[PDB]
């Protein structure tokens, strides 16, 4: 039986379809803070800092693997910052604690947002030191920190990938700052015209959503003994510069970016621009399988069928 906190959202969307199809319908169950309709997998809502709803739903459904993505992202949390802690933290502690009384496996995601501008910002490595600029940045770090802590002191087995930006078409984003690339195609196919909220300089890691769905399910499925690594695998696929997206997509269909920078401008500046994750190839066998072109292609393809 696996819960999946978040569902509703970017990832949780593609996730629960990838989980159901994997291991059967009657084993998942979806969660999130208001119920939707015309869903398919089994909902139960809740906030994930009511720790008292949260176990509830866990015993209830003999909840032994949990797929945690509820949180708020880097934007949402700079403008935030009280909610962004709180959400982040709290729950990912009401998470944890919940795993250590049920004796769960769990998947906790991090984020390239763990990184400062003080670390290499090209092929940064595994295992530099994470002094991040954002608050969003410190609630992933001090995540990692307590999820490795519930491996080694409390012998949960906690993995996690600090995902790069993730592009998909089947749920837009809203809080991040990654998420100018996915706005980027959904503009350029709605209405020819896009207005870019980063610089057209901006250059960070970016990964396709199936290979990031592919990555979750592929680590989750390791024997446990051939990681040396748990709540924070680097992990990479593209990197590319704002106007290097326009230009891709601009093969494709007419359409005018204009480069009208805000607030997430000094968010993104602070990250690197590529990620060494050798780590995950060599210890679970990671390998990208989505490159600029074929994403694109994927994009185009799904936003021009979804706005014929
Ligand atoms: N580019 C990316 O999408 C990306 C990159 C790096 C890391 N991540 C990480 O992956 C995970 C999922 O990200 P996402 O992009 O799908 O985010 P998202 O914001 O699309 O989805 C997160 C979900 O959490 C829910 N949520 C917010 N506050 C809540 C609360 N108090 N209680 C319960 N649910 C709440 C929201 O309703 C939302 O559906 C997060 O941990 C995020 O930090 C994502």
Same mark, same amino acid.
């Given at each position: 039986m696996?819960?999946?906190?978040?569902?509703?959202?970017?990832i949780?969307?593609?996730?629960?379809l990838?989980?159901?199809?994997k291991y059967?319908?009657?084993?998942i169950?979806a969660?999130?803070?208001?119920?939707?309709?015309?869903?398919?997998?089994?909902?139960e809502?809740?906030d994930?800092?009511?720790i008292?709803?949260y176990?509830?739903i866990?015993?209830?459904?003999?909840?032994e693997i949990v797929?945690?993505?509820?949180?708020?992202l880097?934007?949402?949390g700079?403008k935030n910052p009280?909610l962004?802690?709180?959400?982040n933290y709290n729950?990912?502690e009401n998470?944890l604690?919940?795993?250590?009384?049920?004796?769960?496996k769990?998947?906790?995601?991090?984020?390239?947002?763990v990184? +400062?501008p #003080? %670390?290499?910002?090209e092929?940064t =490595?595994?295992?530099?030191?994470?002094?991040? *600029?954002?608050?969003? $940045?410190? @609630?992933?770090?001090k995540?990692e920190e307590?999820?490795?802590?519930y491996?080694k002191?409390? +012998?949960? #087995? %906690?993995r996690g990938?600090?995902? =790069?930006?993730?592009?998909s078409?089947?749920? *837009?984003?809203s809080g $991040?700052? @990654?998420?100018?690339?996915?706005?980027?195609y959904?503009?350029a196919?709605?209405?020819?015209?896009?207005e870019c909220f980063?610089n057209?300089?901006?250059r960070?890691?970016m990964?396709?959503?199936?290979?990031?769905?592919?990555?979750?399910?592929e680590?989750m499925?390791?024997?446990?003994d051939?990681?040396?690594?748990?709540?924070?695998?680097?992990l990479?696929?593209?990197?590319?510069?704002?106007?290097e997206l326009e230009?891709?997509?601009?093969?494709?269909?007419?359409?005018?970016?204009?480069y009208?920078?805000?607030?997430?401008?000094?968010?993104a500046?602070?990250?690197?621009?590529?990620?060494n994750?050798d780590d995950?190839?060599?210890?679970?066998?990671?390998?990208p399988?989505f490159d600029?072109?074929?994403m694109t292609?994927?994009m185009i393809?799904?936003?021009?069928?979804?706005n014929e």
């Amino acid at each position: 039986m696996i819960l999946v906190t978040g569902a509703l959202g970017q990832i949780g969307t593609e996730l629960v379809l990838a989980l159901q199809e994997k291991y059967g319908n009657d084993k998942i169950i979806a969660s999130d803070l208001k119920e939707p309709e015309n869903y398919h997998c089994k909902f139960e809502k809740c906030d994930i800092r009511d720790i008292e709803t949260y176990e509830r739903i866990n015993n209830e459904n003999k909840i032994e693997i949990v797929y945690h993505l509820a949180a708020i992202l880097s934007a949402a949390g700079e403008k935030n910052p009280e909610l962004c802690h709180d959400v982040n933290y709290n729950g990912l502690e009401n998470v944890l604690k919940t795993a250590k009384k049920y004796n769960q496996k769990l998947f906790c995601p991090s984020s390239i947002a763990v990184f +400062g501008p #003080d %670390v290499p910002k090209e092929m940064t =490595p595994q295992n530099v030191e994470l002094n991040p *600029k954002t608050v969003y $940045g410190i @609630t992933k770090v001090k995540g990692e920190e307590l999820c490795d802590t519930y491996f080694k002191e409390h +012998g949960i #087995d %906690v993995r996690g990938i600090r995902y =790069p930006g993730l592009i998909s078409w089947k749920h *837009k984003p809203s809080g $991040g700052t @990654t998420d100018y690339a996915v706005e980027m195609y959904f503009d350029a196919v709605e209405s020819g015209k896009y207005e870019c909220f980063v610089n057209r300089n901006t250059r960070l890691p970016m990964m396709f959503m199936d290979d990031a769905i592919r990555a979750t399910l592929e680590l989750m499925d390791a024997p446990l003994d051939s990681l040396n690594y748990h709540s924070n695998y680097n992990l990479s696929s593209m990197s590319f510069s704002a106007e290097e997206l326009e230009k891709e997509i601009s093969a494709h269909v007419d359409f005018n970016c204009l480069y009208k920078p805000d607030y997430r401008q000094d968010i993104a500046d602070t990250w690197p621009i590529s990620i060494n994750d050798d780590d995950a190839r060599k210890d679970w066998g990671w390998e990208p399988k989505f490159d600029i072109s074929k994403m694109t292609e994927e994009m185009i393809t799904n936003l021009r069928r979804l706005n014929e």
